[PDB]
Symmetry: D2
Subunit: 347 residues, 4 copies
């Protein structure tokens, strides 16, 4: 069958206590799939949802997590092109209204009535989770769900971000936070897109990981006292594009100073209460764009999962049990997560 009770990590108040307990199995709405979430990536956005670091409020009590890879155990009556047993991906964008100007254009993420897994919708830190069938990701059969789970928010995000920077092949892309969860996949997406990857990160295991996944230049922010000058030399004038997948505001500000003239600084990371204080003179006389970038749409999901399918991207994951989700968060705020963490909801 589909059971009545399931295991999930749920918190009832912000920065309170994540309880791995038994919660009721959700019922899929007319348009939603019920997905047996096998593995789920643990994004930093989940730490932000728990701490309430962001302006928007979350749907308490909340089962976070928005990188779920699972099998469709049930569907709604109005779900059309989906089978039971198919591989589905719960992304951050649970669904959207698919009618507003933004949605029609393609910008489904920047939509007023966009449902958000792991914030406004009980996400994928649970064995069974519902997801709007139009926005759920189609994961090909015979795919390692643990390996594809981080591609559902980190992969599509950094793919849309690297497309957001208006880079060309051969252009320098500085990925700020290049050994984190999103940065370690941005390095691989950018190399597969043709760019020269510069990496800025620091800590135990960060430079080694960055060199592992194919990065070109690594600049350790805990050792480099002049980061802007270091990325004004490595790059020969600045990085034609910058991807801020850090959780630091000082990194977001330095990225505006080591970007090339006519370059694009994409803001992807969303630290708590951070502002991108950009010098107006330097941004104008260099014609620097500062582009915010939200999670990708269905087209970006298809393209990022296709990059994953060809074996070009491979997020460095450690699969732990869902029981361990408290200890991941306390390991994620301390910057000690090298690559991605994926939780076995079973365990």
């Amino acid at each position: 069958s589909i059971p009545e009770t399931q295991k999930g990590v749920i918190f009832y108040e912000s920065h309170g206590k994540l309880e791995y307990k038994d919660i009721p199995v959700p019922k899929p709405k007319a348009n939603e799939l019920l997905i047996n979430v096998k593995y789920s990536g643990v994004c930093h956005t989940d730490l932000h949802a728990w701490h309430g670091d962001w302006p928007l409020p979350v749907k308490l009590p909340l089962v976070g997590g928005h990188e779920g890879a699972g099998v469709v155990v049930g569907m709604g009556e109005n779900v059309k092109g989906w089978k039971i047993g198919d591989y589905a991906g719960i992304k951050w964008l649970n669904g959207s209204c698919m009618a507003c100007e933004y949605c029609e254009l393609g910008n489904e993420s920047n939509c007023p009535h966009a449902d958000l897994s792991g914030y406004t919708h009980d996400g994928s830190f649970q064995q069974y989770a519902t997801a709007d069938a139009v926005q759920a990701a189609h994961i090909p059969q015979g795919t390692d769900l643990a390996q594809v789970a981080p591609i559902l928010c980190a992969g599509i995000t950094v793919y849309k971000a690297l497309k957001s920077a208006n880079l060309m092949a051969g252009h320098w892309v500085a990925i700020s936070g290049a050994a984190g969860g999103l940065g370690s996949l941005a390095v691989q997406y950018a190399k597969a897109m043709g760019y020269r990857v510069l990496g800025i990160d620091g800590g135990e295991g960060k430079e080694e990981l960055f060199r592992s996944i194919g990065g070109e230049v690594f600049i350790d922010f805990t050792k480099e006292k002049d980061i802007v000058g270091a990325v004004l030399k490595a790059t020969d004038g600045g990085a034609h594009g910058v991807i801020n997948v850090s959780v630091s505001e000082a990194a977001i500000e330095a990225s505006t100073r080591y970007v090339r003239a006519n370059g694009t600084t994409v803001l992807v990371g969303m630290p708590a209460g951070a502002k991108c204080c950009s010098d107006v003179f330097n941004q104008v006389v260099k014609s620097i764009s500062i582009v915010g970038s939200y999670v990708g749409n269905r087209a970006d999901t298809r393209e990022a999962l296709d990059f994953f399918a060809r074996g070009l991207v491979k997020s460095p994951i450690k699969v732990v049990g869902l029981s361990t989700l408290p200890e991941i968060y306390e390991k994620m705020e301390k910057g000690q997560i090298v690559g991605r963490y994926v939780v076995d909801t079973s365990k």
Copy 2:
């Protein structure tokens, strides 16, 4: 002939005393035209060069002014396609190196070795001024030089800025400072480009001018206490594009908040020591680009002067004498300049 002495407004120290006295007539270099500057637009950048409001240093003693419209009285030996008597325009970009990556691409303004009239090169607040012949603007014969002078920095700038905002016809463009020197021409360029122009300015004669030149919605910043909300209503979700041609940093910051999702806030105005402190969360979840924009290139100059030629743009100018240049600056810092001021170098 070409005389030995000429009249020019020259200052020897920043925010010192602008002296309208007799200075030697320059000699055109091998690549430069000597232009009998008949009329010259007075930009706010000239007030910034005098006050030294900007990071870069100016070439003291300096004859400012970078909107000169004049006749070519002499040329250099290596100048090719130019006649004596032709109408030339001294723009902010006096010249460029025309060899570096940026110059080759087309971004001649963001070039390391770009010569700048009215900053690093004795500009057009003088009867005779030299200008690199490759970057000088070709003004058609039978043109009102007084009327075309403001198009040489304000016009090409706001044209490149409106092209920088990635707007489409019918999209809302909020021009911040829409009755100033650059804003009053941005309103006209945007309407001729097809956009719905919202205007934000305030003071005596600003709303009336804005309504004169064809603006749609005017929002008076000295009366409107909620500017962001007012431009979130007029526009129905925010302005698809914003052009910051203000000299205020609070305007630059509010423009990041009343821009539409997936909209572009172009920074054109460069107030003294201003920073574009942008909320990272709001910029990311709305995918807002913040694009700096410098003066246009030769293509943008050609296209903006073609817009002027068809009679579509007409900067509201008051032609005073060059003798009056001190009194313009003290009228420009006080925000009391409605439209543009143009100086008769003769007078």
Copy 3:
């Protein structure tokens, strides 16, 4: 109620006999609206569907017409954001699969499983017609349905085509067939988009109409023996963009020769068995793009209907009865349709 029988123009074989008789009222599927089609534009595509001029086969017996403007008299159970009494527009794209790569990207028209009103789906030459609710056009209340009907295929088409030509404001756009049904709206969309409109058409009432709707240069193909030379002079080097809304193949070929270097020739008209024989040398040494363009998507529909709402476009329509649909087709093959014809389904 909703009646059992209705009046419609139906043909049972290609180029057979259009019978205005009583046909059963359709039943809306789970996703479809039943639209009381008040007025319907008569496109040339309907003449092509009747003659079978196109490669694809039509769904016999067929009730053509794909420019229906009507009120929603009934809906399906899975239709979400729609009211009874709302104004809906049956476009050529009746619906789409909204799942394939093209649909996800935004290209809903170039979709393998795209349902097509007036070809593969009983269209809008009938009092009551069904239309997929996701693709039906939202026509604002208090709109002249007769006046908005031609905007449902001609308007969105020529809007997407003018966006397809990668034109800028001030650039020359040669609309081939500028007094026809699509050309007369392309002239107005292009002028509202900022372009200089050149018009090529010929016959009684074509030049007068073209001058009426705001065209700049008219070149009469029945009087001009050198059309390419005439549009190499008017334009000063060729038209930066060309829109082929003709039903002639010689026009489609000449458009490749009077387009500017680096210009774009958009093919919109689809004459019977026509080929765009383009000289490869001239297309390469001038870097001329030849872009085919299909009907617009939901975003283009929204933007074109917004242009119509502001009063910027106004298709020259003559509203006749649906009874007269045979006599329109025989007037449309002879090129004698100046502007658009709209049929009162009531009459």
Copy 4:
């Protein structure tokens, strides 16, 4: 010194007799470099110039060749940033007017007064050749001139062509003629740009070369009777982009049929008297662009030579003597040139 006589291959009438004899050494004009052409690539455009296969006429008597890599032995007085001994590249675009709208925009190749090496200017099939210093390619020191010579017309061309197809990383690019001189470099540029390369060529040594340089799918046009169907399967719907670097018109036409919906067929090859007869219906209902592409500009030259510098592209060259240039042409019309031929002007 610089000698008075030199060795060059010169023909006095079209398809006449190429004579390797002693011709006078040219004198550099005020803006031109005299380049000791060490090695020169032999393009098919040189065979077209000899046969007079193209509409434009050549400058008889003509020393063809437009892929010269050499050292600057002398300069003109108005040449600015150049040294004697530097490595210069004579490309097809010898120079341009650098003042017309196209040149200002960046499209220096599609310019009315563009000087063309190997057609309108004695090219690089000679020991000493002059080249406009603004358009000459800057080849880094310590570069294999024989290996960089084919990058001067083939490399920059196929780079600009792959940028012309509006492809994204992961998209399918079908290179028609993928083992020829331009195709063998288009395969490498496309793989370094991130695309999946499909190759269409045939003959001895073509499939082996294509597999050597990193191609994914090879489709042999002499064995495949259904080329369109084969490239509608390999690609799963058609190639998102096609690069026609063939010398066949049937290939140019089939490329319009095996391109994906919303795909771009770039015409690069310019066979004799060829026309791109494109079905208008299929091009419109699939929104297929057919983009002609001429040699790249200075920015594309810089970017293609940078790709070469990183070791990412490596044209398969055979360096023969200049004495052998007749036997290359008779080997190039027969399609028997696998990769590129480079002539030692010394030999």
